[PDB]
Symmetry: D2
Subunit: 242 residues, 4 copies
C-alpha cells in the first residue's frame, strides 16, 4: 500500500497546480511551491496516488498555495496582544481535484472565507460552534443553516463517520457572494467527483497558525487545526515524498 508519493507524482501535482494558479492570475513565487504545499491528510490517504488525481475516487488530498500570512501585529496596541492570534491576514489558493476533500476539522482562532475561482465547491459544515477555552464569546452573524446534503456524495473509505457532524451543505460557484466560515465551526469541502476541472478556490482568512518542521511569544508552536479523524490530524503536518 502507498505510504508516500513519488518525487515525480509530487512535482507533477504541484507544478500543474501552480501553473493553473498562475493562469488564473494568482501571485505565485517560487518559495510558495515547496515540499509542504501538497497535503495528504493521513498515511492512509497516500493511496489517492495509486490511481491518481484524475481517478475521481474520494480521498482527502489537496494543494495549498499561500501568498500571504501576515500577523498584523505591527501597530496593534499592546493591550490586544492576548487576542492578536485571532486576527492577522492570510491569502491562499486551494486546488482540489475531482472527488477529493479537505477533511472535517475546525479552527479555534481562524475565521475564513471562500471565493470559488474555477469549478464548484461543496461545503459540509456544522452551523453550531464548539466552545474552546473560555465560554464567553461574542456573536453577530451566526453561521447560516444552508441545506441538507444532496444525494450521491462519495466519502473517503474509513473516514465516513468523521463527516457525521457536518450536516449543513452549500454548493458554491464562481461569482457567488463570499462564503464565511466562522472560527470554531466544523467544516469540510470537496470538488464534485464529476467535475471536468480541479476546484480552485481563494481563501481569505485571519492568520494561519501551522507549525512548520514568532510574531508574539504566545504564538510559538501554536496549532490551530483540529481534525475530526485522528488519522488526518497527524498527516496534515509533513508530506512523505519518495
Amino acid at each position: 500500500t502507498r505510504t508516500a508519493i513519488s518525487r515525480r507524482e509530487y512535482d507533477e501535482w504541484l507544478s500543474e497546480a501552480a501553473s493553473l494558479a498562475r493562469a488564473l492570475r494568482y501571485p505565485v513565487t517560487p518559495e510558495m511551491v515547496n515540499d509542504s504545499a501538497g497535503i495528504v491528510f493521513g498515511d492512509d490517504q497516500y493511496e489517492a496516488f495509486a490511481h491518481g488525481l484524475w481517478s475521481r475516487e474520494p480521498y482527502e488530498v489537496m494543494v495549498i498555495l499561500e501568498s500571504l500570512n501576515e500577523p498584523a501585529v505591527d501597530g496593534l496596541p499592546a493591550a490586544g496582544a492576548a487576542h492578536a492570534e485571532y486576527s492577522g491576514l492570510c491569502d491562499k489558493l486551494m486546488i482540489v481535484h475531482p472527488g477529493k476533500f479537505c477533511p472535517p476539522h475546525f479552527h479555534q482562532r481562524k475565521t475564513e472565507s471562500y471565493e470559488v475561482v474555477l469549478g464548484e465547491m461543496e461545503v459540509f459544515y456544522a452551523p453550531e460552534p464548539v466552545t474552546v477555552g473560555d465560554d464567553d464569546v461574542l456573536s453577530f452573524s451566526p453561521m447560516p443553516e444552508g441545506s441538507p446534503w444532496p444525494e450521491g456524495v462519495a466519502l473517503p473509505a474509513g473516514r465516513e463517520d468523521s463527516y457525521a457532524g457536518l450536516t449543513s451543505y452549500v454548493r458554491l460557484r464562481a461569482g457567488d457572494p463570499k462564503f464565511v466560515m466562522h472560527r470554531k465551526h466544523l467544516h469540510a469541502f470537496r470538488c464534485p467527483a464529476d467535475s471536468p476541472v480541479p476546484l480552485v478556490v481563494r481563501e481569505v482568512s485571519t492568520y494561519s497558525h501551522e507549525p512548520t518542521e514568532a510574531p508574539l511569544p504566545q504564538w510559538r508552536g501554536l496549532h490551530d487545526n483540529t481534525f475530526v479523524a485522528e488519522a488526518a490530524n497527524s498527516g496534515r503536518l509533513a508530506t512523505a515524498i519518495a
Copy 2:
C-alpha cells in the same frame, strides 16, 4: 467647476469597472455595484469628471468593489472585544484610472495588503508610522524603506502638500508578491498617467470601518480613515450624483 457627477457618467463608470472586474474573475454581485462604490475624495475632486476618467489628469477618485467586510467577531472571546476593531476580513477590488489617486491617509486600525491584477501600482508612503496615542504599540516587521520617488509624478492641484510625508515609493506589478501596508502608516497610490489600462488591485485587509451604507456597540459610528487633506477628509463619503 463640477460639483457632482451625472447619473450617466456614474453608471458608465461603475458599469465598465464591474465589467472589467468580472472579466478578471472578481466576484461581483449586483449589490456591490451601488451609488457609494464610485468615490470622489472631496468636492474639488468632482472636477475629474469635467474631462473624464481617461484625461490622464491628476485627481483623487476611484471605484471600490467590496466583496467582503467580515467583522470576524463571532467566536471571538469577549475578553478581546476591545481590540476586535483591529481585526476582521475585508476583500475589495480597487479600480483607479490613469493618473488618478487614492489620496494620502492612514488607518489607526486597518492593516492592508495589495495584489495588482492589471496594470501597475505606484505606492507612496511614510516608512515610519504615525503615533496615534502613545501607549505601548507592538512591532514585528516594520515597513521596508522602499525607494525615492521617480521623476514625472503629477499630483492633484491643491493637494500636492498632502503628499509631502509619503517619502517612500514602490512600484507594484501583476505577479509580484503581496505588499503589506501596516496600520498607522500614511499612504497613497496611483495608476501611472501613461498606463493603457486602469489599475486593478485586489486589497485584502482587516475590517473596513467606513460608514458607507453593528457587529459590536463600540464599532457604531466608527471611522477608521483619516486623510491628510481636510478637503478630502470631511466631504469624502456620499457621492454627489446628479
Copy 3:
C-alpha cells in the same frame, strides 16, 4: 441630433474596450486603438451616444480590435492568385454593449467564426446563401437551421425591416463550440439588452477586405461588406469624431 461622437466619448469608449480586451488577454498594441476601431453604422446611429453605451437602447455601434489580417499570399502557387482573396487570416476581438448590434450584412469572400469570450451573443442569420459573381460554387457544410427568434428582441429604430431576411437564430455563450458563418450569408448579432456586461467575441475569419481612408493587384479597393440597410452600408467607412 447627434451627427458625430465627441473626442471624450470616443476615447472613453475605445479605452475601456481595449482595457477589457487586455484583461481578457487579447493581444492589443497601440496601433490597434485608432480612429476607425469604434464603428457607427450610419449617421443616424450616432444617436446611440445621446444616452450612451449603457442605455441598453438598440443601435448599430461596436468596437473592433483587429490583431491580424494576413493575406496568406506568400508561398501560394500563382495559379491560385484569382481566388486568394477568399483566403487569408483575420483575428479580431469585437465588443458590443448591451442591446447594440452589428447590422445585417454579408460578405462575398469572407467566411468567419465566432468565439464568445464574455457575455452572450445573439446571432440572426439567413441559412440560404446568395449568389455573387459566378453561380458555380462549392458546397460542403451548409449553414444550420438554428431556431426561430425568441420574443422581446428590440431592433434599431428605422432599421427593423433590414432584419426581415435573417430568420434563423442562435444564442452563443462562452465555452460553446465555434460557430461558423459561411461567406454569402446574411447575418447580424447583438448583445442582449439585459446583459450585465458588454459582449466580447473573438472572430477568426479569412482576410478582411475593408478599404482604409496591396497583396495582389486585384485586391486594391476591394469592398467585401454588403449591408442591407443602405444607411449603414455607408457609415461603416469612417467615424465622425468631434
Copy 4:
C-alpha cells in the same frame, strides 16, 4: 525504452491541459479532449514519459486542443477548388511543457500565426522558404530575418541534426503581436526548459490537413505536415496508449 504512454499518464496529461485551457478561457468541448490530442512525434519520443512532462528534458511531444478546422469551401467558386486546400480556418490551443518541442517541419499549404497566452515561446525557423515544386509562387511579405539562437537550448537526443536548417530565432511572449509563419517555411518551437508553466499558445492558421480522426475529393487522404526527421514523420499519427 518506453514504447507507449499509460492510460493514466495520458488522461492526466490531457485533463490538466484541458483544465489549464479552460482556465485561460479557451473553448474546450468534450470532443476536443480525445486520444489523438496528446501527440508523440515518433516512437523514440515516448521516452518523454519515462521521467514525465515536468522533467524539463528535451523531447518532441505536445497537446493540441483543436476548436476549429473549417474548410471554408462553402460558397467558394468552383474555379478556385484547386487552391482551396491552401485556405480554410484552423483554431487550436497548443500546450507544450518545459523543455519540450513541436518538431522541425514545414507545410506546403498551411500558413499559421502564433499568439502566446501563457509562458514564453522560442521559435526556430528557416527565413528562406523551401521550394516545393518550382512553378511560380507568390510573394508579399517574406519572413523576417529574426535573430541567432541564444545559448542554452537543449535539443532532443537523436534529432539535433533536424534543427540545423532552422537558423532564425524569435522569442514570443504574451501580449506580443501576432507572429506569422508562412507556408513552406521550416519551423519548430519549444517551451524554455526553465519555464515555471507549460507554454500555452493559440494558433490561428489555414486548414489543417492531418488525417487524425471529405470537404473536397482532392482533400481526401491529404497530409500537409512534412517533418525533417523521418522518425517523427511516419510514426507521428496515432498515439500509443496502453
